[PDB]
Design a protein around this ligand. Structure first.
Ligand code: HEA
Ligand code: HEA
Ligand SMILES: [Cu+2]
Lengths: 29, 99, 96, 49, 31, 522, 49
């Protein structure tokens, strides 16, 4: 069903948001 | 494969004309081989051009042999035999026509 | 009757006619009373130059091709000359 | 046979010939320039210590 | 868009694709 | 489907790679002029971004997979590619690697150390600017995505063979990229293993390609060779297919020697794996071993010679029609004969000892790979583009782009065969004073070629405006001019939409679901 | 495995024991003329095939 696809969409959303927050630390130290 | 079996086989395939694009396609492919066409083949070509009710392909075969005729001497010889064939045909040279 | 009439005797001048198909329907078959100024017409209409048998490069275009090649090459070499020529080796005398 | 057979024979044989004369004058000219200059220089350095 | 469905997105898309080595080289030369 | 974005990313990354060409050569013009960082800070980073971005992002996707996922099923007759789920996987994996590679360029210092990253101290000493892990991950995802597309192309031309084609008279692009993916299988995962080995060495400090522990870099040297030699055969062999088709349809649909051609391509696919050898002949292997190597590189030089003699026979005796793809094919053939000549030159035993890491090998491999692959991709785009895109491509500007590319790339990569034998080093940022001559005209030519790329961009924008009096019909009619069709079928398929003049009969643009009825061969 | 959705496995078994194949596997070359007087016949569940 989709009742588990909704929190999976949420954890995927944070899992592809937060490395983009990681990369200014990668370029700036 | 040789000269004479070529002439016989494609005159036999060539009296199966019955149409415009059929006689023009068999003129194309039977002209595009690796041998000069026999005069009997071009006499059957002009007779099939009379059969299929079309004149400019009977012009087109002559400029085709004008390219493929490989010299000027065989060109004047074909002009002679094809000249009295034109007198019994009625088709003009392009050099006599000036489009 | 039954022959054409010099309606347009210079067929290689125009294929700007809308209904060329009427002129193609006009054609006939008595074979060598064809009025040669419109026996030009069957050869040109059936074997001319439009659509099929149109040359890849028109007469005007080939000069435009060579002109554009030379202009692009000149713009490239001129752009190279006006981007940078600065700060090289020490001096020609040093090489000596 | 005919014209295309005559043209492939004449064409490939004259291509052999033209590549042969281009590289033969190239190799003769420059390789003999090398044998003159280098063997003369080695002759100077060896025969004159 | 009303002015750019694909009229400037080709030019601008290729301007970005040509200019990203320039800004990478700029921020790497600044270190 | 996947093909349109698949081509858009290739053009994006190609302009990025030509910008890298612009910057590198603009520095290489005069000694120490444009950039202060004449070191692996920013300059070897630029040459690795250049090389790995352009070979992996341009020739590899467009030449194998773009023409693959648009033109393998349409030539064999398949509805869609046999696993329609993982073309989508592999292509969307790709621009994540573009982001990964530009992130490898962007970060603090830059561990860019050439595209062929040799271990011994590319190790943790270089990982204060830890870029090279991002570079090897971008190469790792491009690696597995090309692998996935290779499996997909193999299974598509195996099971979805339309009942026309047996295995004895197949088309040359179809059998070409089948050999290409069948050759890609046997060389990709070796280098995937080498990526994870040396990544484990430079991350989790076990260090078996590094110095300590008796680690030996020559194992990696064999490995990346054993990958990168069939890699360049992947780079050229669908190009040979495309050149076969354009040489076919612009001169003479009877081409020379089909069964001979596919035997020669299988001979290249056989003999091309087991010579990884010449690339470091020099390293000090055994004499009988390196002599056997030199002998076998001659036999890999044979069958490509057989193929180009075949196309030499093909263009002979046919009605040439000098459009822009026929010019691409003839320039392809002329420059690739000379590049294979210099291949035989470098292929000798005792000449790599004078030619390694100089600009003579650089001019050679740019000559074969750039001229061959990019002329083939040129021919492919200016050939199949009005079929897919539906618009006619303004032939006169295509002609001037061809001439401008030809003279620009020739005047770039011909002076390298002079700069190389005098003893230039490879990847030199600041060359000695006696080498300032030919690099100047190489810089002139680089500006010429990037001007021609911008001209291609104006042509690609001119793909909007439906010119009718510019280019309409390849292979103009023979002697007919009243009948109207595509004028050639050397086998009698003529079933619904498939024929012997293959896939020129779909429509412009082709439908979202074609091939309702299975085609048949005569 | 019967009474399931999408009976394309019916006519594989059905055509396996009775002859008439599933998804018109068969080729054609009727050794014909190609002529407009007697062209190759066209059978379809449609007007265009
Ligand atoms: C797609 C690109 C491509 C292709 C097809 C080839 C094809 C060949 N390459 Fe090259 N090569 C590279 C790209 C390519 N190469 C690259 C990228 C490198 C190393 C750079 C590095 O990675 O940094 C390299 C390196 C390289 C070296 C390494 C030397 C050094 O590092 O300095 C050598 C030496 O043997 C070599 C030789 C050959 C040979 C013999 C062929 C042969 O396949 C060519 C054979 C073709 C023919 C011979 C032409 C047709 C025939 C004739 C015209 C008529 C008959 C003549 C003869 C058969 C004698 N190549
Ligand atoms: C994909 C192959 C490819 C191509 C096309 C080019 C093209 C160019 N390369 Fe490069 N180059 C390499 C692959 C390539 N190179 C490799 C492997 C190295 C070795 C790296 C090293 O070892 O570190 C190298 C190295 C290299 C060096 C360093 C030499 C070294 O030490 O070995 C230099 C120096 O300036 C250079 C310059 C150029 C220039 C000026 C071009 C110009 O030709 C660019 C102009 C060409 C274009 C205009 C093509 C545009 C293409 C497209 C956008 C897509 C295709 C077609 C279209 C649809 C348009 N290249
Ligand atoms: Cu190689």
């Amino acid at each position: 069903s989709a009742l588990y696809l909704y929190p999976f969409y949420a954890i995927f959303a944070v899992a592809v948001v937060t490395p983009l927050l990681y990369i200014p630390n990668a370029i700036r130290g | 494969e040789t000269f004479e079996e070529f002439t016989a086989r494609y005159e036999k395939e060539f009296d199966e004309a019955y149409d415009l694009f059929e006689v023009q396609r068999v003129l194309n492919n039977c002209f595009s081989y690796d041998l000069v066409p026999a005069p009997a083949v071009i006499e059957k070509a002009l007779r099939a051009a009379r059969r299929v009710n079309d004149l400019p392909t009977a012009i087109r075969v002559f400029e085709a042999l004008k390219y493929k005729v490989e010299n000027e001497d065989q060109y004047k010889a074909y002009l002679d035999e094809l000249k009295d064939v034109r007198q019994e045909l009625g088709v003009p040279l392009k050099e006599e026509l000036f489009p | 009757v039954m022959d054409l009439q010099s309606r347009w005797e210079n067929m290689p001048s125009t294929e700007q006619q809308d209904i060329v198909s009427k002129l193609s329907e006009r054609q006939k078959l008595p074979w060598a009373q064809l009025t040669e100024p419109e026996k030009q017409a069957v050869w040109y209409i059936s074997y001319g130059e439009w659509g099929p048998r149109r040359p890849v490069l028109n007469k005007g275009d080939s000069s435009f091709i060579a002109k554009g090649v030379a202009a692009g090459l000149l713009f490239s070499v001129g752009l190279f000359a006006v981007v940078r020529m600065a700060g090289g080796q020490d001096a020609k005398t040093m090489n000596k | 046979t005919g014209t295309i057979k005559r043209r492939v024979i004449m064409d490939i044989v004259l291509g052999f010939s033209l590549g042969g004369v281009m590289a033969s004058y190239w190799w003769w000219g420059f390789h003999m320039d090398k044998i003159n200059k280098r063997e003369k220089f080695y002759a100077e350095l060896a025969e004159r210590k | 868009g009303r002015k750019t469905p694909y009229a400037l997105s080709h030019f601008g898309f290729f301007a970005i694709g040509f200019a990203v080595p320039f800004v990478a080289c700029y921020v790497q030369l600044k270190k | 489907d996947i093909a349109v974005l698949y081509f858009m990313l290739a053009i994006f990354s190609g302009m990025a790679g030509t910008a890298m060409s612009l910057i590198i050569r603009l520095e290489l013009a005069a000694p120490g002029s444009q950039y202060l960082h004449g070191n692996s800070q920013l300059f070897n980073v630029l040459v690795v971004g250049h090389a790995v971005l352009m070979i992996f992002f341009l020739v590899m996707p467009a030449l194998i997979g773009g023409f693959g996922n648009y033109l393998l099923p349409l030539m064999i007759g398949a509805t869609d590619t046999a696993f329609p789920r993982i073309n989508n996987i592999a292509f969307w994996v790709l621009p994540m690697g573009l982001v990964c590679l530009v992130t490898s360029t962007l970060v603090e210092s830059g561990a860019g150390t050439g595209w062929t990253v040799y271990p011994p101290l590319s190790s943790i000493q270089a990982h204060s600017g830890p870029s090279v892990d991002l570079a090897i991950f971008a190469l790792h995802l491009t690696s597995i995505s090309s692998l996935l597309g290779a499996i997909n192309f193999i299974v598509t031309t195996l099971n979805m063979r339309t009942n026309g084609m047996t295995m004895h008279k197949l088309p040359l692009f179809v059998w070409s990229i089948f050999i290409t993916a069948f050759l890609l299988l046997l060389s990709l995962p070796v280098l995937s293993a080498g990526i994870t080995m040396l990544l484990l060495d430079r991350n989790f400090n076990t260090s078996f390609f590094e110095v300590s522990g008796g680690g030996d870099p020559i194992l990696y040297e064999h490995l990346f060779w054993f990958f990168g030699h069939p890699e360049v055969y992947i780079l050229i062999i669908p190009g040979f297919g495309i050149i076969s088709h354009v040489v076919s349809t612009y001169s003479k649909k009877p081409v020379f020697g089909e069964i001979s051609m596919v035997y020669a391509m299988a001979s290249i696919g056989l003999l091309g794996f087991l010579v990884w050898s010449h690339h470091m002949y020099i390293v000090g292997l055994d004499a009988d071993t390196r002599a056997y190597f030199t002998s076998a590189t001659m036999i890999i030089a044979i069958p490509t010679g057989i193929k180009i003699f075949s196309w030499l026979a093909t263009i002979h005796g046919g009605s040439i029609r000098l459009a822009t793809p026929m010019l691409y094919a003839i320039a392809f053939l002329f420059l690739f004969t000379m590049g294979g000549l210099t291949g035989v030159a470098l292929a000798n035993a005792s000449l790599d000892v004078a030619f390694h890491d100089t600009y003579y090998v650089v001019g050679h491999f740019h000559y074969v790979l750039s001229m061959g692959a990019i002329f083939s991709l040129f021919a492919g785009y200016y050939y199949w583009s009005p079929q897919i895109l539906g618009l006619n491509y303004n032939e006169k500007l295509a002609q001037i782009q061809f001439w401008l590319i030809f003279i620009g790339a020739n005047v770039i990569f011909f002076p390298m065969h002079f700069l190389g034998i005098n003893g230039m080093p490879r990847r030199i940022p600041d060359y000695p004073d006696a080498f300032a001559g030919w690099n100047y005209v190489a810089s002139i030519g680089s500006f010429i070629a990037t001007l021609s790329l911008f001209l291609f961009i104006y042509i690609l924008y001119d793909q909007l405006v439906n010119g009718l009096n510019n280019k309409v019909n390849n292979k103009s009619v023979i002697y007919n001019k009243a009948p109207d069709f595509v004028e050639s079928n050397t086998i009698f398929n003529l079933n619904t939409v498939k024929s012997s003049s293959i896939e020129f009969l779909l429509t412009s643009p082709p439908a979202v679901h074609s091939f309702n009825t299975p085609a048949v061969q005569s | 495995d019967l009474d399931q959705e999408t009976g394309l496995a019916r006519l594989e078994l059905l055509g396996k024991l009775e002859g008439i194949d599933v998804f018109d596997t068969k080729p054609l070359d009727s050794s014909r003329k190609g002529t407009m007087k007697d062209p190759i016949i066209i059978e379809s569940y449609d007007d265009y095939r």
